[PDB]
Structures are given as structure tokens and as C-alpha cells.
């Protein structure tokens, strides 16, 4: 069930010798708190600290501010359960030191195809700044950069309206988006909402992927979307949000060799 190796994060645990993905306790620097996390450890010696997972629609994501702060769902040795680690814990890990983390969003469609999108220098701010999302730049990935916003065509300024960098977190009971209405209440989730969204992984789990305006009384595009990879009417089958020290991603042809 729970492994004995501990560290500041899952990469620290992998560096110590851990070989199996599973449950481990981590103690982020300066927090004086220890908590369980699911580490995804591969053959390359990479250790990903997973903070979000969707795969079967078993966990209700319409939770309030406090629940999104503390975490909900379940952690399993097999990594086959849905959960949200908790905004407070995500903040503690991503800001524990001066070493930057990279966020990898892993997506899987209903046909078994998967894609990724990486963001460098990912951080989640303190509760005082409503767990604001900030990143330096999109680092690559075939899923596309939905966090930069997307032009759905229903407005020239769609891109500026759907960007996520710099947005505070919102829950139905703590609206911090840039919409006159309540993005979180309308979709029924917690997320870094703007004048809503281009990438939204905490949405409603729609079986089969395809859904439409007809699916909900008011016609909201509230599924698990990533506009740069699939249409807004296509909800993902699985999603994973996981972090790793950024230096782990610049280990290959991500460098200039000189002479
Ligand atoms: Ca609002």
C-alpha cells in the first residue's frame, strides 16, 4: 500500500532509489507538513508528483472552496482512482524552493490516443492570492497550448477571454473569474477560470466523449476539454496533471552542445 522512501517530492524519492509508482509520503521544504501523494516513477528515473487524475467519472468535481483547498477523491497504489490533491498541497510543493517545476498535462481520448502539453516554471500561489496559476511559457506537446487561450470563433477576443495564465482559482462559492456570471457554478467545478475556459480538466465526465448543447438544459460546454487538441464538444477519457523539477525535461536534445 504505502512505500517507505520519503523526500521533498517524487523526483527526490526516485533519486533515492524508488522504482515503483505508488503511494509515498513527501515533506515539502519549509512546510513542516508531510502527506501522501501518488508518484509516477518510470524507467528513465523520472518521478512525477501527480495532483489530478480523471478516468471514470466516479468522483464529483463540483466541490466548494474548502474541499478544493484540502483535496478530495482517492489515492490508490495502482493510480486508478480520481482525485484532486488540494490547492494548499499543490502550492506547498510547487513553491518549496527556487528550483522550477514543469507541469505536464497528459490526456487520453476515447479511441485510446494520448497527448501531452508541458508548461515551464509552473506555480500555484498562496491562498491569500486565491491560488493563482502562473507559468513562464508553454514548453511543448502535441495536445497544444490551451492555457494560452483559444479562438472558438464566437468572438474576435475569444483567445484573450479563454487564457489561463495568471488566473485565480474559482469554486461555485468563491468566484474569482473575469465573467459577469459564475463560471464555476455554471460548469459545476473548480478551476482557474477566466471568461471561462479553453482548457478545463475538472469538468463533467461525459461517457463516450461526444456531448452537445442538448446534453444540458442550458447548453454549457462543461465537459473535460482541451480546445487545442479536440473540439469543445468532446470530453476526455482520462487526464493527468503532474509535476517534476524542470531540469528533468532538459535531459535530452533540449540542449546546445558546443565546440
Ligand atoms: Ca464571475
Swiss-Prot record:
Keywords: Blood coagulation, Calcium, Coiled coil, Disease variant, Disulfide bond, Glycoprotein, Hemostasis, Isopeptide bond, Metal-binding, Phosphoprotein, Secreted, Signal, Sulfation. GO terms for cellular component: blood microparticle; cell surface; collagen-containing extracellular matrix; endoplasmic reticulum lumen; external side of plasma membrane; extracellular exosome; extracellular region; extracellular space. There is a cross-link at residue 255 (Isoglutamyl lysine isopeptide (Gln-Lys) (interchain with K-432)). One of its GO terms (molecular function) is cell adhesion molecule binding. Detected in blood plasma (at protein level). Changing residue 132 to C: In Tochigi/Osaka-2/Milano-5/Villajoyosa. Its main location: secreted. Glycans are attached at residue 165. Changing residue 176 to D: In CAFBN; hypofibrinogenemia; heterozygous; no effect on fibrinogen complex assembly; decreased fibrinogen complex secretion. The keyword Mitochondrion does not apply. Residues 1-247 form the Fibrinogen C-terminal domain. Together with fibrinogen alpha (FGA) and fibrinogen beta (FGB), polymerizes to form an insoluble fibrin matrix. Has a major function in hemostasis as one of the primary components of blood clots. In addition, functions during the early stages of wound repair to stabilize the lesion and guide cell migration during re-epithelialization. Was originally thought to be essential for platelet aggregation, based on in vitro studies using anticoagulated blood. However, subsequent studies have shown that it is not absolutely required for thrombus formation in vivo. It is linked to Congenital afibrinogenemia: Rare autosomal recessive disorder is characterized by bleeding that varies from mild to severe and by complete absence or extremely low levels of plasma and platelet fibrinogen. The gamma-chain carries the main binding site for the platelet receptor. This is Fibrinogen gamma chain. It comes from Homo sapiens (Human). The lineage of its organism: Eukaryota, Metazoa, Chordata, Craniata, Vertebrata.
